[PDB]
Each structure stands twice: as structure tokens, then as C-alpha cells.
Design a protein around this ligand. Sequence first.
Ligand SMILES: CC(C)CCC[C@@H](C)[C@H]1CC[C@H]2[C@@H]3CC=C4C[C@@H](OC(=O)CCC(=O)O)CC[C@]4(C)[C@H]3CC[C@]12C
Ligand SMILES: CC(C)CCC[C@@H](C)[C@H]1CC[C@H]2[C@@H]3CC=C4C[C@@H](OC(=O)CCC(=O)O)CC[C@]4(C)[C@H]3CC[C@]12C
Ligand SMILES: CC(C)CCC[C@@H](C)[C@H]1CC[C@H]2[C@@H]3CC=C4C[C@@H](OC(=O)CCC(=O)O)CC[C@]4(C)[C@H]3CC[C@]12C
Ligand SMILES: CC(C)CCC[C@@H](C)[C@H]1CC[C@H]2[C@@H]3CC=C4C[C@@H](OC(=O)CCC(=O)O)CC[C@]4(C)[C@H]3CC[C@]12C
Ligand SMILES: [K+]
Ligand SMILES: [K+]
Ligand SMILES: [K+]
Ligand SMILES: [K+]
Ligand SMILES: [K+]
Lengths: 261, 261
Amino acid sequence: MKRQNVRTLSLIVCTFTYLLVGAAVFDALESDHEMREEEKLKAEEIRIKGKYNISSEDYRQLELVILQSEPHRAGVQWKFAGSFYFAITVITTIGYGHAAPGTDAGKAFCMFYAVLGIPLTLVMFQSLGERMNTFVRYLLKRIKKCCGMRNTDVSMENMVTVGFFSCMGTLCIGAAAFSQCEEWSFFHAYYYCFITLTTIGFGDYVALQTKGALQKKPLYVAFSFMYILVGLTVIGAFLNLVVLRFLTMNSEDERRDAEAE
Amino acid sequence: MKRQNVRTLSLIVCTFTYLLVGAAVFDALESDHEMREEEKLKAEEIRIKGKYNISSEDYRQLELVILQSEPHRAGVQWKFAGSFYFAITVITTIGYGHAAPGTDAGKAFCMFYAVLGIPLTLVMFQSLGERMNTFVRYLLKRIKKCCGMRNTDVSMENMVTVGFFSCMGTLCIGAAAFSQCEEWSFFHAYYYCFITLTTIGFGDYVALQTKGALQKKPLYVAFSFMYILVGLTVIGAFLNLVVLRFLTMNSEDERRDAEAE
Ligand SMILES: CC(C)CCC[C@@H](C)[C@H]1CC[C@H]2[C@@H]3CC=C4C[C@@H](OC(=O)CCC(=O)O)CC[C@]4(C)[C@H]3CC[C@]12C
Ligand SMILES: CC(C)CCC[C@@H](C)[C@H]1CC[C@H]2[C@@H]3CC=C4C[C@@H](OC(=O)CCC(=O)O)CC[C@]4(C)[C@H]3CC[C@]12C
Ligand SMILES: CC(C)CCC[C@@H](C)[C@H]1CC[C@H]2[C@@H]3CC=C4C[C@@H](OC(=O)CCC(=O)O)CC[C@]4(C)[C@H]3CC[C@]12C
Ligand SMILES: CC(C)CCC[C@@H](C)[C@H]1CC[C@H]2[C@@H]3CC=C4C[C@@H](OC(=O)CCC(=O)O)CC[C@]4(C)[C@H]3CC[C@]12C
Ligand SMILES: [K+]
Ligand SMILES: [K+]
Ligand SMILES: [K+]
Ligand SMILES: [K+]
Ligand SMILES: [K+]
């Protein structure tokens, strides 16, 4: 009886203590960096606003104009290439938000589109991940036969090893690809890859948004979309191997508790 | 044998055709709206840049200054309240990106923090969702006993009804709460609630970012965090009821295929 509850409460208490350990570390890592940046930006504002004697209403309007032009200076978003990039970022839940629906009709359709798109996408990547893990298990057992191993067992530790180095590999191949095209540093390209395939998607870095690359370099658009849909497949297969048993075993324990009645 | 493959391929083909149906509709809904907005913003830029004779290097620097000041004009982010809000938006994968780690040390810690935080959060919300569905099943069967129903069965259709109206309810309670505090329209507040609890998180709308509300209105900070952690629990419970069987039945079918050997 109680086992389901004690594991639920221990998960909750673990989560909230993990948030506290998070928050106090992000304060320690960069409250001072924000404090430097604010002062430096304020000085640059004051000197420019003064040198041109910009009126407060004019500066406010210019600020709004700049902030709303930021999504357009990267090149036209809402054409088929960019609408396909957006649709990917909705149904996979990346949600960069480099562009977002302007009209209320766009917002309303985006909600109805996500409602159906996301269950479909979860079931697709989890099915294709289970196929990947089955294929890897076959090829690894055959590899042990070819290597003449003393037994053909393929333990959980072997699968978890190949899964983890598949994740590390696909992130490094992403970083090496994007750093050569977007001119980000390798570390920032790796950060962008991790934040994409994890589906966090802050959207401070966004691929393709460079001198109209969404229109002038369609082979690289194709790479970016295939990289998302393949990388999420590999991460999905890794969660399918390591984590998914824990989602169901609470219900399995409840079924066992009912069968013990 | 083939059933696992034909369902995998049909899911893939369904996903890609669903992306095409998406992209061609977002083009139809708002390519023209972008085309109007670009022209209007270009005219406002030209008139202001000309009226003050702003030099191109000065305008470029001012543009960078404005874009980097946007995350600070909302109030200081990296203090405990804002670091806790950020930590929520990482481990739940909302990822608004209203703020993002400035220093490379912040980025590196954010990656190690997400790696462990997200599996923990999935297991927490799926466990707590399974608890919610069990409790709802109990209370609904007792409600049928109290109402004197001709039988005490609690079918899937009854659970799916209560789950769906729980999702619709928690979104409406969110929209009614935020529209009264952020001064968004009710539709935009509902859009923000749906985009938050779906974990897409574009970050064009973000709660708390208003005249320092992260520091002056801590009771409303508390509401925003509880609304995220409760709303995701309800959405998690709904996916646990409707979708989760489809993630596993592909492996169950493979086990059956092995047992038939
Ligand atoms: C993706 C890779 C890099 C990391 C994967 C980590 C997860 C597999 C870990 C992280 C947190 C773990 C959970 C943290 C705490 C608990 C509570 C624990 O419950 C108890 O001990 C209660 C008493 C009992 O059930 O015996 C059961 C395991 C569980 C769910 C853990 C299951 C495994 C989790 C999800
Ligand atoms: C299912 C698996 C086995 C195969 C996947 C095939 C991919 C190589 C396809 C699927 C969708 C394709 C993309 C769909 C749409 C576009 C937009 C297209 O852009 C335009 O036509 C420009 C439009 C404009 O600028 O108005 C360039 C090709 C591209 C990126 C395609 C590149 C090739 C992709 C990624
Ligand atoms: C969250 C609410 C609002 C919507 C939930 C929708 C899902 C429950 C639907 C959406 C798309 C559906 C999938 C679309 C297509 C298929 C392929 C289908 O495969 C076959 O028919 C192959 C042959 C066979 O297996 O008999 C099996 C069901 C499945 C996975 C569906 C399972 C149920 C899904 C995930
Ligand atoms: C687990 C369940 C059953 C109970 C959940 C309790 C909540 C009501 C707690 C958990 C975390 C708490 C929050 C943790 C941290 C803060 C930041 C705090 O802000 C400050 O102290 C300002 C700091 C600064 O400005 O430097 C205001 C209260 C608040 C939002 C707390 C409000 C109450 C919360 C949401
Ligand atoms: K997400
Ligand atoms: K996001
Ligand atoms: K997201
Ligand atoms: K985002
Ligand atoms: K943004």
C-alpha cells in the first residue's frame, strides 16, 4: 500500500530540494555578471541618448521598433521553409520563439495544432526509439559472436554504454557541424545542440537565422531539420532504455497491491 | 513480426504529412501579416533614423544595446526569486529564455543541471499523475454509489471526460488569474497558459516580468510557481491516462512476438 505513496513523496521532496540547489547556484554563478552588464548597458544608453538629444517618447518608440524588428532582420520567417521550421519547433515542443504567431487566428490554430501534434510526436519518437534499441541489441550481439566472445549475453550495462555514447556522439557531430556554419564557438554550438535535443529551446541561439539562410542555403536547411528529427530519436531511445521503466512501475506496484487483496 | 514495423512507418509518414499540413497553413495564416509588419517597421525606422541623422555605426551599437537591455528592463533576473523561476523553466523544459546563462560557467552548469533534473521531473510528474488518476477513480466510483447509480463501474470514457475537463478547467483558471494581473487580454492569457503547460514556452509572453513583480509581489510569484507545478501535474495525468499505453504496447507486441517463437 504505502510504497506508492512513499515513493511519490520522496520524489516531490527530492524535486523541491533540487530546485533550491539549482537556484542558489545560479545566483552564485551570475548575479554579479548581470550587475556588471546592467551598469555597462546603462552607460552606453545614457551616452548615446544624450549625444543625439533623443526625446523620451522618441526613444520609447524606437525601442519598440527595434524589439519588433529583431525577428524580421534575420530574414522572412513565414514562407514555406520557415513555416516548416516553426512547425517542427511546435510539435517537438522545442519552441524557440524566434517567431511566434502574430494574428489571433495564428495563435488559435497553433493551440489546436499542438494539441494533436504532440501526442503523435511522442508516440512516433518512442516507437522509433524502441526500434533503434532493438536493432542495436541485435547488432551488438552479432558483434559479440563475430568477436568470438565467451558468451553472447547483451546486458543492460552494454546497452546503456552504447546509448550514452550515441548521445555524446550526436551532440558532438551537431556541434562540429553548426560551429562550421553559424560561426559560433564550438562550446556555444555544443550548448545549442544540447538545448535543442533536450527540447528546452531557450532561443538565444537559433540555427538557420543567418543572412536569409532559410532561403539561400536549402541544403543546410535540410541538414538542420534532419538533425533535429534524428537527434530527438537518439535521445528518445536513451530515455526509453534508462527511464521509461520508472514511469510504469508505480502502476505495476498498484496492480500487485490489488492482486494481493 | 511486421506489425511493429508497419506501425512505425505509418507513424513516420503521418508525422511528415502532419508537418506539411502545418507549414502550408501557417503560411496561409500570416505570411501577409509579416509582410505588412516589415514595411511598417521599416518606415518607422527610416523616419526616426533620418530625423536625428543617426550614423550607421551609432544605430548598430544602439540596436545591440537595446536588444541586450530587454532582459534587464523587466527587473533583475538573477536573484533567488528569479533563479528559482529559471530553475523551474529548465527542469520542466518550459525554457522561456527571458533570461539565459551569460557566463560560460553558467551555460556549463545549466547543461549538467538539465541532464539530471529532467528525468527526475518526468518521474515525479508521471508518478503524481498516476496518484491523481487513482484518487479520481476512487472519488468518482464513490460518487456513483452516493448518486445511487445502477452500477459502480468507472469506465475509460468517464475518466477521460474528467481528465479533459480538468485540463480545460486549469487552463481557464490560469487565464482568469493572469489576465487580472498582467493586463493581457483573456485570450492571450489563455494562450500563455496553454503554451506554458504544454511546455512549448515560446517566451513572447512571460509572467512575473512586470515592473519588478519578482520582488514587489511575492504572493504572486508563489501563485505562478504553484500554477506551473500543479498544471503540469494535471496535464501529466491526462497523458498518463490517454497516451501512455501507446508508448509501451510496441514493446509488449515485440515480447508477444518473441513468446510466439
Ligand atoms: C538520463 C540519465 C543521465 C540519468 C537518469 C536518472 C534517473 C534514472 C533517476 C534520477 C532520479 C531517480 C529517482 C529518484 C528517487 C526515487 C525514489 C525511490 O523511492 C524509494 O526509494 C521509496 C521506497 C521504495 O520504493 O523502496 C525510487 C527510485 C526513484 C523514483 C529514482 C528512479 C531513478 C531516477 C528517476
Ligand atoms: C522520412 C525520411 C526517411 C526521409 C526524410 C527526407 C528529408 C531529406 C526531407 C523531408 C522534409 C524536407 C524539407 C521540406 C521543405 C523544405 C523547404 C525548402 O525551401 C523552399 O522550397 C524555399 C521556400 C521559400 O523560400 O519560399 C527547401 C527544402 C526543405 C528544407 C526540405 C529538405 C529535405 C527534407 C528535410
Ligand atoms: C491528447 C489528446 C487530445 C489526443 C491524443 C491523440 C493520440 C491518442 C493519438 C494521436 C495519433 C495517434 C496514432 C496515429 C497512428 C497510429 C498507427 C496505428 O498503427 C496501425 O494502424 C498499424 C497496423 C496495426 O497496428 O494494426 C496504431 C495507432 C497509432 C500509433 C495512433 C495511436 C493514438 C495516437 C497517438
Ligand atoms: C510541496 C507542496 C505541498 C507545498 C509547496 C510550497 C510552496 C507554497 C512554496 C515552495 C517554494 C516556495 C517559493 C520559493 C522561493 C520564493 C522566493 C521568495 O522571494 C524572495 O525571497 C525575494 C528574493 C530577492 O528578491 O532577492 C518569495 C517566496 C517564494 C516565491 C516561495 C513561495 C512559496 C513556494 C512556492
Ligand atoms: K519542451
Ligand atoms: K522552449
Ligand atoms: K520548450
Ligand atoms: K523558448
Ligand atoms: K526570445
